Amino acid sequence: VQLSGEEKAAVLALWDKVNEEEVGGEALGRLLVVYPWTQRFFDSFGDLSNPGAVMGNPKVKAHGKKVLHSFGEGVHHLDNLKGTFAALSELHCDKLHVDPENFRLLGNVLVVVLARHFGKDFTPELQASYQKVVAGVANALAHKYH
Amino acid sequence: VQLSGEEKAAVLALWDKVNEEEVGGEALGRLLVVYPWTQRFFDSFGDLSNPGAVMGNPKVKAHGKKVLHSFGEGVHHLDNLKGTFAALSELHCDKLHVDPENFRLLGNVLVVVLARHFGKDFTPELQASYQKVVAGVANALAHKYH
Amino acid sequence: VLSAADKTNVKAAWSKVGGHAGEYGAEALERMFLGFPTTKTYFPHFDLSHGSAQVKAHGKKVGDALTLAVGHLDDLPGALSDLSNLHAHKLRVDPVNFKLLSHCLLSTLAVHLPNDFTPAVHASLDKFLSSVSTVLTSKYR
Amino acid sequence: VLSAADKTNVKAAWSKVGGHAGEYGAEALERMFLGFPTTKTYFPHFDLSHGSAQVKAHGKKVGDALTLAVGHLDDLPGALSDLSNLHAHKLRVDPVNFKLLSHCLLSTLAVHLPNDFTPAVHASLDKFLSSVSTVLTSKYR
Ligand code: HEM
Ligand code: HEM
Ligand code: HEM
Ligand code: HEM
């Protein structure tokens, strides 16, 4: 969350190439395929049986965009990370009751999708940066669970 | 972190019956035997070969007792947890490099030792409050760890 | 529980839990709904009140499935088969919940069996509650 | 792995890598020491400097052990036996680290095999690895 002077500048340049509906749906899409117990929280999206049907799912993409768009906010607010999400921390711990460890998971499925979309530009140094940004995002988004 | 009157009062009342010496050692000893990978950070204690010998180990009782005393600090400071331990976080993430999740393990071993020690008094009511202090302590230690 | 000492510490253990399997299964579930609020969710049709007739009776089936596992440490996969379907494929229970339940199950034994719940027995009982939770989520494998 | 569909999908996907087994092995290790700092601690005697000599040489044995596991998916335990001893009993590696390297290994294939790294193949390889890890950490049983 508290990167460096060079890292922030590194994280906000690659995010200018991040395509929020494309990265969101795949990321969301891969989360539900690789970690099926999560489907439980999306029973309203209809059919989530097999891999192809999940990714083509309109409700999986549109929501994918919400998640990534929100991510964008956090990324452009690396200082007030926690507070930028209290609005959402509550939604998941109170209304939804999602387990914190699931935030850690989705951020990881998210780094692999960036890795698949940027290839060798998503260097090991850069991925390191996103892991720092991915965890604090996953945690202050659970700041209302303890 | 954010209990309530009837809870804080119940937590403290019991602590008063907690033997930091006797509970710390058992706690710390039951960590090294159940989660044997934890021995890697204690090679300076000598023989941690088998169960019988770990429990009778002086540096396992001595240190256990420091651990629990530190828990006492948190139990009397449910407001300044991130502070009360700020300089203990750095110690584990920097000089020691312990994984944050080992904190949640220890805390659970600790809860089970209380269970064993207070029996029926350690009611599913009180343990609930307990799982929150542990919640918070294990948390106030990985403050800086992302 | 994939060793000789455990199987021995497991079977040796449950031997002491004997006919309380049910009680504990129940109390363990209470300790879990109270201590880990987010687990309430898999049970809306249950009356999570203390002494509830539902929890008591479900605590029993849990107590049972465990007495069955203790008697089949050689083949947990085949014994706990159908139970794997139910949690993974059907109910789609989050794997984390299993750790939380094994935790609450060990706290319970702690309460009723202090002299029997040794550190040596405490450990094998952990690999066991773990060999179990893994056979019941393996539909994610 | 653990199922037809799943051992199929993991052997076509691993053959698409063929010669790059250790190469990726190394990058995965780099990706891991950089992004997950606390893992360096197991390698003082290694030169973790980018493109080190030790790391790439070790990246190779890792690659190798992974290749000698798809070819024995039926018996992970046998194949990777002496590898359990070394990690669990000798080095006593925390089981969390195995997740981090599996993550870092998945990011590596993805970088290098975008069109072959579909979601289903992504899922299978999460089985392969998770089941791999649960054999090197098994002496904790
Ligand atoms: C990676 C971190 C995550 C972020 C940044 C995120 C973000 C969001 C956002 C922006 C919303 C929209 C809420 C609104 O309409 O105001 C939301 C809703 C929701 N989230 Fe996530 N989320 C995350 C993780 C998770 C996980 C892991 C789960 C799975 C259990 C989850 C389950 C849900 C559900 C079920 C909804 C409601 C969607 C609907 O019913 O329309 N979230 N999340
Ligand atoms: C809530 C949980 C924990 C608390 C409250 C805690 C507290 C402490 C305290 C008070 C010290 C001594 C610091 C000083 O000298 O001022 C310490 C040291 C240490 N801790 Fe922990 N600790 C916890 C968890 C862990 C865990 C799970 C591990 C296992 C990896 C660990 C490994 C160590 C090591 C290696 C030392 C140095 C001991 C020595 O060499 O003398 N700690 N901890
Ligand atoms: C210790 C491992 C577990 C075992 C051996 C186990 C055992 C059982 C058994 C025997 C049944 C069927 C009972 C019947 O015939 O109605 C069952 C059902 C069920 N289990 Fe568990 N369970 C375990 C863990 C969990 C966890 C972790 C959760 C919650 C997070 C859970 C939630 C459920 C639910 C919702 C049902 C269906 C009950 C109903 O709706 O009637 N179980 N379990
Ligand atoms: C993908 C899972 C893993 C596999 C297949 C694996 C495989 C190997 C192999 C083949 C060796 C022996 C190499 C030799 O003969 O020198 C080895 C040694 C070793 N492994 Fe891994 N490993 C894995 C995960 C880990 C993890 C999670 C860590 C810790 C973060 C780790 C740390 C080590 C260390 C320190 C050695 C000793 C190397 C030396 O000092 O020469 N490994 N591993």
List, in order, residues 6 or more apart from B31 with CB less than 8 Å away: B38, B105, B106, B109
The ligand 4 site (C-beta within 6 Å) comprises D 39, 42-43, 61-62, 65-66, 83, 86, 91, 93, 97-98, 101, 132, 136
Check A128 against D120: CB less than 8 A apart: no
Task: Confirm if B106 and B24 have CB atoms less than 8 A apart.
Answer: no
Q: How many residues does chain B have?
A: 146
Tokens 């922030």, residue located: A8
Check A1 against B136: CB less than 8 A apart: no
**For residues B62 and B69, what is the distance between their CA atoms, to the nearest angstrom?**
11
**For residues D107 and D104, what is the distance between their CA atoms, to the nearest angstrom?**
5
| Residue spans per domain, chain A | 1-146
> In this structure, what is the dihedral angle of CA atoms B23, B28, B29, B35, given to the nearest 10 degrees?
140
**For residues C116 and B29, what is the distance between their CA atoms, to the nearest angstrom?**
17
Task: Confirm if C141 and D2 have CB atoms less than 8 A apart.
Answer: yes
List C-alpha distances in Å: B109 to A42, B43, C131.
35, 20, 19
Q: How many residues does chain C have?
A: 141
Q: Which residue of C has its CA nearest to B131?
A: C35
Nearest alpha-carbon partner for A43 in B124, C91, B79: C91
H-run or E-run covering C115: none
For the record, the structure tokens of D15 come out as: 């053959």
Q: Hey, is C7 helix, strand or coil?
A: helix
Q: Return the number of other C-beta atoms located less than 10 Å from residue B53's C-beta.
A: 13
Q: Which residue of A has its CA nearest to C100?
A: A99
**For residues A77 and A63, what is the distance between their CA atoms, to the nearest angstrom?**
21
State the amino acid at position A17 in one-letter form: K
Pick the ligand that lies closest to the CA of residue C54.
3
- Of the candidates C37, C41, C92, the beta carbon closest to that of A37 is on C92
All residues of chain C having their beta carbon less than 8 Å from the beta carbon of residue D131 are 141
A105 alpha carbon to ligand 1 midpoint, in Å? 13
Nearest alpha-carbon partner for B122 in C106, A117, C101, A31: C106
**For residues B122 and C108, what is the distance between their CA atoms, to the nearest angstrom?**
10
In degrees, rounded to 5, the angle at the alpha carbon of residue A95 between the alpha carbons of residues A112 and A144 is: 70
Nearest alpha-carbon partner for D39 in C75, B99, B41: B99
**For residues C78 and C75, what is the distance between their CA atoms, to the nearest angstrom?**
6
Counting as contact any 3 or more CB pairs under 8 A, the partners of D are: A, B, C
List, in order, residues 6 or more apart from B46 with CB less than 8 Å away: B57, B59
Q: Return the number of other C-beta atoms located less than 10 Å from residue B94's C-beta.
A: 11
- Of the candidates C3, C138, C141, the beta carbon closest to that of D141 is on C3
CA-CA-CA-CA torsion sign (A87, A92, A94, A96) = positive
Q: Hey, is C96 helix, strand or coil?
A: helix
**CA count, 13 A, side-chain hemisphere, D22:** 11
D87 is in an annotated binding site: yes
All residues of chain D having their beta carbon less than 8 Å from the beta carbon of residue B101 are 96
Phi and psi at D109, nearest 5°, equal -55, -45
Q: A101 exposed, middle or buried (CB, 10 Å; 0-12, 13-18, 19+)?
A: middle
Task: Confirm if D104 and D32 have CB atoms less than 8 A apart.
Answer: yes
Check D38 against B97: CB less than 8 A apart: yes
Nearest alpha-carbon partner for A64 in A11, A106, A13, A116: A106
**For residues D89 and D93, what is the distance between their CA atoms, to the nearest angstrom?**
9
CA–chain centroid gap for C69, Å, is: 10
Q: Return the number of other C-beta atoms located less than 10 Å from residue A33's C-beta.
A: 23
Q: Hey, is C70 helix, strand or coil?
A: coil
Q: Return the number of other C-beta atoms located less than 10 Å from residue B13's C-beta.
A: 11
**For residues B81 and B21, what is the distance between their CA atoms, to the nearest angstrom?**
22
A78: left (phi over 0), alpha (psi -120 to 50) or beta: alpha
For the record, the structure tokens of B114 come out as: 């209380």
**For residues B75 and B135, what is the distance between their CA atoms, to the nearest angstrom?**
12
For the record, the structure tokens of D83 come out as: 């590898």
Fold (CATH) for A1-146 = Globin-like (1.10.490)
> In this structure, what is the dihedral angle of CA atoms A120, A122, A123, A126, given to the nearest 10 degrees?
170
The DSSP letter of residue D85 is I
Q: Return the number of other C-beta atoms located less than 10 Å from residue C58's C-beta.
A: 17
For the record, the structure tokens of D124 come out as: 């299978």
Task: Confirm if B75 and B8 have CB atoms less than 8 A apart.
Answer: no
Q: Return the number of other C-beta atoms located less than 10 Å from residue D45's C-beta.
A: 6
The number of helices, as runs of H, and strands, as runs of E, in chain B is 8, 0
Q: A20 exposed, middle or buried (CB, 10 Å; 0-12, 13-18, 19+)?
A: middle
List, in order, residues 6 or more apart from B58 with CB less than 8 Å away: none
Total number of domains constituting chain D: 1
For the record, the structure tokens of C22 come out as: 């049910």
Q: Which residue from C33, C34, C39, C62 has its CB within 8 A of the most atoms of ligand 3, so it is best to mutate?
A: C62
All residues of chain A having their beta carbon less than 8 Å from the beta carbon of residue D35 are 124, 127-128, 131
**CA count, 13 A, side-chain hemisphere, D36:** 21
List C-alpha distances in Å: D12 to D16, D18, D116, D127.
6, 10, 10, 15
Task: Confirm if A90 and A144 have CB atoms less than 8 A apart.
Answer: yes
A50: left (phi over 0), alpha (psi -120 to 50) or beta: beta
State the amino acid at position C124 in one-letter form: S
Check B1 against A146: CB less than 8 A apart: yes
Task: Confirm if B65 and B25 have CB atoms less than 8 A apart.
Answer: yes
**For residues D9 and D13, what is the distance between their CA atoms, to the nearest angstrom?**
6
**For residues C37 and C54, what is the distance between their CA atoms, to the nearest angstrom?**
18
**For residues D139 and D141, what is the distance between their CA atoms, to the nearest angstrom?**
5
Distance (Å) from the C-alpha of residue A30 to the closest C-alpha of chain D?
6
For the record, the structure tokens of D7 come out as: 């051992």
**For residues C85 and C139, what is the distance between their CA atoms, to the nearest angstrom?**
7
Q: Return the number of other C-beta atoms located less than 10 Å from residue B124's C-beta.
A: 20
**For residues C101 and C43, what is the distance between their CA atoms, to the nearest angstrom?**
14
State the amino acid at position D78 in one-letter form: G
What is the atom index within ligand 3 of the atom nearest the CA of C132?
A: 2
For the record, the structure tokens of A26 come out as: 């795949």
List C-alpha distances in Å: B88 to A20, B66, B70, B76.
40, 12, 10, 17
Please name the residue ranges forming H helices in chain A. Answer: 5-14, 20-34, 51-55, 58-75, 81-90, 101-118, 124-139
Task: Confirm if B97 and D41 have CB atoms less than 8 A apart.
Answer: yes
**For residues B139 and B120, what is the distance between their CA atoms, to the nearest angstrom?**
28
List, in order, residues 6 or more apart from B60 with CB less than 8 Å away: B25, B28, B29, B32, B42, B45, B48, B54
State the amino acid at position D30 in one-letter form: E
Resolution at which this structure was determined, Å: 2.9
A18: left (phi over 0), alpha (psi -120 to 50) or beta: beta
First-last CA distance in chain C: 21
**For residues B134 and B128, what is the distance between their CA atoms, to the nearest angstrom?**
10
Tokens 């004997």, residue located: C18
**For residues A15 and C37, what is the distance between their CA atoms, to the nearest angstrom?**
37
Nearest alpha-carbon partner for C100 in D13, A54, B134, A110: B134
Domain residues for the domain of C120 are 1-141
**For residues A129 and D84, what is the distance between their CA atoms, to the nearest angstrom?**
32
**For residues B105 and B100, what is the distance between their CA atoms, to the nearest angstrom?**
9
What experiment produced this structure?
A: X-ray
| C61 Cβ inside 6 Å of ligand 3 | yes
Nearest alpha-carbon partner for B22 in B59, B52, B64, B71: B64
The DSSP letter of residue B146 is -
Asked if the C-beta of B139 comes within 8 angstroms of chain A's C-beta atoms, the answer is yes
**For residues C13 and C8, what is the distance between their CA atoms, to the nearest angstrom?**
8
For the record, the structure tokens of A10 come out as: 């590194």
Secondary structure (DSSP) of B49-104: SSHHHHHT-HHHHHHHHHHHHHHHHHHT-TTSHHHHTHHHHHIIIIIS---THHHH
Q: What is the CATH number of the domain that holds C47?
A: 1.10.490.10
**For residues A71 and A24, what is the distance between their CA atoms, to the nearest angstrom?**
10
Nearest alpha-carbon partner for C117 in C3, C24, C19, C16: C16
Tokens 């893992």, residue located: D39
Asked if the C-beta of D96 comes within 8 angstroms of chain B's C-beta atoms, the answer is yes
State the amino acid at position C139 in one-letter form: K
- Of the candidates A132, A139, A146, the beta carbon closest to that of B135 is on A146
List, in order, residues 6 or more apart from D28 with CB less than 8 Å away: D59, D62, D101, D104, D105, D107, D108
Task: Confirm if A78 and A12 have CB atoms less than 8 A apart.
Answer: no
Task: Confirm if B92 and B98 have CB atoms less than 8 A apart.
Answer: yes
List, in order, residues 6 or more apart from C123 with CB less than 8 Å away: B33, B34, B51, C6, C9
For the record, the structure tokens of C66 come out as: 């465990």
For the record, the structure tokens of C128 come out as: 């066991």
Enumerate long-range contacts of D63-68, CB under 8 Å, 24 or more apart. Answer: D63/D21, D63/D22, D63/D23, D63/D24, D63/D25, D63/D26, D64/D21, D64/D22, D64/D25, D66/D14, D66/D21, D66/D25, D66/D132, D67/D14, D67/D21
